[PDB]
């Protein structure tokens, strides 16, 4: 197919709830090596989010079954083996996405908003890998996830105003990363408070007809601060 045909196939697959088809189509689009439009990059993201999300959900279900008392060691081993099967599927998906990001999407991105989008995507899929990793690989995937978020964070801070909704909320997602993945609540609070306060300082500059674009995310930052500071 050509690019426009692949995008139409992706949209058909989405309507049919056939997300593996949708991801395959948008992977093929990405491999043509050109910068994606806003619409195309959202189709890619939605496709793989649904594909990986199904495996993440199945993994949690089987992991919980495995964490319940089973005296029959043969049955215990059957659950472990099935969990590992799902794990390998999940890791294959994440590595496919990470390879698309490292070979095509991040290197070809010529504008800050694109760059931040794909770096945050990279952080997400390393995070997913970290959820199922063990030992030294868990530390490595967590560190790779953090590095990607941090790079997106620094670009957003350099290129966007403190009230920009992409910047806010990259800040929100990053602060939650510190709270939940790194178990670092003091830093989580610090990040969220800096982003909240710096946006608050510029409420002056927003239009009365559009300020909610910013304040909706700022309220989410503030809600997390209330919870976290009360412990």
Told to check if 86 binds its own copies by CB under 8 A, we report: yes
Complex with its own copies: residue 12 or 201, whichever CB lies closer: 12
Count CB atoms within 10 A of the CB of residue 107: 10
The CB-of-140 to its own copies minimum distance in angstroms stands at 27
Complex with its own copies: residue 82 or 228, whichever CB lies closer: 82
Complex with its own copies: residue 2 or 208, whichever CB lies closer: 2
Both ends of the chain: CA-CA distance in Å? 54
What's the rounded Cα separation, in Å, for the pair 167 and 157? Answer: 7
The CB-of-132 to its own copies minimum distance in angstroms stands at 14
**Stretch of 1-9, 41-49, 128-136, 190-198 contacting its own copies, by CB under 8 A:** 1-9
**Region 12-71 residues binding its own copies, contact defined as CB under 8 A:** 12-13, 15-18, 54, 57-58, 61-62, 65
Count CB atoms within 10 A of the CB of residue 38: 10
Complex with its own copies: residue 15 or 207, whichever CB lies closer: 15
Give the one residue of 32, 35, 78, 180 binding its own copies; rule: CB under 8 A. Answer: 78
Under 8 Å CB-to-CB from 189, ≥6 apart: which residues? 175, 225, 228, 229
The CB-of-72 to its own copies minimum distance in angstroms stands at 9
Q: Which two tokens stand for residue 14?
A: 């989405």
| Greatest CA separation for the chain | 66
Under 8 Å CB-to-CB from 8, ≥6 apart: which residues? none
Size of the site for its own copies (CB under 8 A): 22
The CB-of-94 to its own copies minimum distance in angstroms stands at 18
147 in helix, strand or coil? helix
What's the rounded Cα separation, in Å, for the pair 16 and 25? Answer: 14
**Region 183-212 residues binding its own copies, contact defined as CB under 8 A:** none
The CB-of-221 to its own copies minimum distance in angstroms stands at 30
Q: Taking Cα atoms as reference points, which of 127, 103, 217, 209 lies closest to residue 170?
A: 217
Give the one residue of 68, 69, 73, 74 binding its own copies; rule: CB under 8 A. Answer: 74
The CB-of-27 to its own copies minimum distance in angstroms stands at 17
The CB-of-41 to its own copies minimum distance in angstroms stands at 21
Q: Taking Cα atoms as reference points, which of 148, 147, 188 lies closest to residue 171?
A: 188
In the complex, the residues that contact its own copies under the rule CB under 8 A are 4-5, 8-9, 12-13, 15-18, 54, 57-58, 61-62, 65, 74-75, 78-79, 82, 86
């Amino acid at each position: 197919m050509d690019k426009s045909e692949l995008v139409q196939k992706a949209k058909l697959a989405e309507q049919a709830e056939r997300y593996d088809d949708m991801a395959a189509a948008m992977k093929a689009v990405t491999e043509q090596g050109h910068e994606l439009s806003n619409e195309e990059r959202n189709l890619l993201s939605v496709a793989y989010k649904n594909v990986v999300g199904a495996r993440r959900s199945s993994w949690r279900v089987i992991s919980s079954i495995e964490q319940k008392t089973e005296r029959n060691e043969k049955k215990q081993q059957m659950g472990k083996e099935y969990r590992e099967k799902i794990e390998a599927e999940l890791q294959d998906i994440c590595n496919d996405v990470l390879e698309l990001l490292d070979k095509y999407l991040i290197l070809n991105a010529t504008q800050a908003e694109s760059k931040v989008f794909y770096l945050k995507m990279k952080g997400d899929y390393f995070r997913y890998l970290s959820e199922v990793a063990s030992g030294e690989n868990k530390q490595t995937t967590v560190s790779n996830s953090q590095q990607a978020y941090q790079e997106a964070f620094e670009i957003s801070k350099k290129e966007m105003q403190p009230t920009h909704p992409i910047r806010l909320g990259l800040a929100l997602n990053f602060s939650v990363f510190y709270y939940e993945i790194l178990n670092s609540p003091e830093k989580a609070c610090s990040l969220a408070k800096t982003a909240f306060d710096e946006a608050i300082a510029e409420l002056d500059t927003l239009n009365e007809e559009s300020y909610k674009d910013s304040t909706l995310i700022m309220q989410l930052l503030r809600d997390n601060l209330t919870l976290w500071t009360s412990e």
